[PDB]
Amino acid sequence: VSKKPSLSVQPGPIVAPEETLTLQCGSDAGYNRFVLYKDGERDFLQLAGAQPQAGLSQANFTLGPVSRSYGGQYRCYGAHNLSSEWSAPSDPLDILIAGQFYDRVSLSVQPGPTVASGENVTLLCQSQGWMQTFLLTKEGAADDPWRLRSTYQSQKYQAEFPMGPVTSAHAGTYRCYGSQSSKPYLLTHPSDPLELVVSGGGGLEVL
Amino acid sequence: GEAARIPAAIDAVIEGIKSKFSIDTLGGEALKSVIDGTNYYDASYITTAIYNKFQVSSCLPSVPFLGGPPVPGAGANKPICSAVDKLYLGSGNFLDKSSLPGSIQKDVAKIVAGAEQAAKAKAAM
Numbered sequence: 001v002s003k004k005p006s007l008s009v010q011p012g013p014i015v016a017p018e019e020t021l022t023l024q025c026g027s028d029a030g031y032n033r034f035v036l037y038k039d040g041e042r043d044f045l046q047l048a049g050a051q052p053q054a055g056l057s058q059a060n061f062t063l064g065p066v067s068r069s070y071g072g073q074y075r076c077y078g079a080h081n082l083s084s085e086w087s088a089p090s091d092p093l094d095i096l097i098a099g100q101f102y103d104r105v106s107l108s109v110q111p112g113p114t115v116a117s118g119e120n121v122t123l124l125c126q127s128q129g130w131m132q133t134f135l136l137t138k139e140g141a142a143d144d145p146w147r148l149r150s151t152y153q154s155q156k157y158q159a160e161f162p163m164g165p166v167t168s169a170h171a172g173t174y175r176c177y178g179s180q181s182s183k184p185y186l187l188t189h190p191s192d193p194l195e196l197v198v199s200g201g202g203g204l205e206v207l
Numbered sequence: 208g209e210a211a212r213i214p215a216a217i218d219a220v221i222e223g224i225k226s227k228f229s230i231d232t233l234g235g236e237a238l239k240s241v242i243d244g245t246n247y248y249d250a251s252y253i254t255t256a257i258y259n260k261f262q263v264s265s266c267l268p269s270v271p272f273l274g275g276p277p278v279p280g281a282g283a284n285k286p287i288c289s290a291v292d293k294l295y296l297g298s299g300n301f302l303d304k305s306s307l308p309g310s311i312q313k314d315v316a317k318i319v320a321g322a323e324q325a326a327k328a329k330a331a332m
């Protein structure tokens with residue numbers, strides 16, 4: 001079986017309802033077709049054609065307006081022609097749907113509103129309602145989010161994300177989400193954005 | 208000329224189908240044997256007939272019932288699957304099990320409309 005393709009997601013793995021996600025499935029093994037499957041479902045979601053140039057071909061699958069159904073794991077496969085056998089599965093891509101619960105989450109800086117140069121930045125995501133996990137994402141750096149299991153503390157459910165000592169790379173806009181146990185790909189509404197700005201070596205929250 | 212008109216319309220739609228979907232003469236007679244009723248103008252029935260007789264469902268990749276990797280499909284070597292692939296899966300084009308019937312139906316509807324427009328007008332002239 002041929003080497004697996006690569007499956008990427010743009011803009012990012014976490015998507016809000018009524019939005020369209022471009023999943024790019026590409027390879028260098030001269031594939032003229034790519035097929036997309038989700039969570040073991042026997043019917044393929046989409047079949048796409050891509051003319052290989054020197055063996056390099058990419059299919060930009062477009063998911064339609066997203067709903068609670070789009071949440072899960074996605075794998076794409078590649079084939080040389082209509083009758084050829086399919087490649088090995090690509091590495092699984094996790095697509096998460098937001099805005100699926102009424103419970104809200106809040107993102108704050110556990111050290112405090114300002115963090116000094118020698119101090120560490122710790123981002124606290126919390127909710128009054130029961131959450132199994134909390135997810136942290138940064139704007140622009142749209143990769144796989146940082147998921148931490150929740151803890152019951154101070155009659156709240158919360159997770160601390162230790163970012164380490166203040167650095168200039170910590171600057172940016174951050175959002176956290178919550179997920180419940182049975183449906184880990186369904187997330188809450190995003191928390192209010194937390195913009196962090198580097199000031200005098202230190203970090204500050206900017207509104 | 209009512210008999211000539213109903214027989215000629217059927218022949219024209221069969222020829223259009225054979226042209227667009229690269230179906231051999233034998234498949235043309237297979238379609239004719241079920242299209243001879245007054246269903247020659249319904250793209251829906253023709254699409255179902257094409258699906259059943261030419262096994263268009265067997266053109267698409269399938270996954271084993273009890274678990275397994277995706278496979279090309281039982282009919283991928285048949286000419287109908289190559290014709291469907293050229294017609295509806297080019298570079299930059301997309302397809303799913305739900306979209307294919309509608310695409311085939313739209314093209315069959317174009318065939319029917321063109322056949323009867325051309326047949327009526329030439330005869331009237």
Ligand SMILES: *[C@@H]1O[C@H](CO)[C@@H](O)[C@H](O)[C@H]1NC(C)=O
Nearest residue numbers: 002079080081082083084085
């Ligand atoms: C399809 O690709 C296979 C290689 O996986 C090749 O052996 C075969 O000849 C190809 N068939 C066509 C019709 O191009």
Ligand SMILES: *[C@@H]1O[C@H](CO)[C@@H](O)[C@H](O)[C@H]1NC(C)=O
Nearest residue numbers: 118119120121162163164165
């Ligand atoms: C956080 O900062 C303190 C000193 O401010 C340091 O002792 C500690 O090691 C830092 N956290 C981690 C995880 O190292």
Ligand SMILES: *[C@@H]1O[C@H](CO)[C@@H](O)[C@H](O)[C@H]1NC(C)=O
Nearest residue numbers: 049050058059060298299300
């Ligand atoms: C998908 O997008 C990439 C980059 O934008 C491009 O190289 C590729 O040709 C596109 N593929 C299709 C099928 O549009």
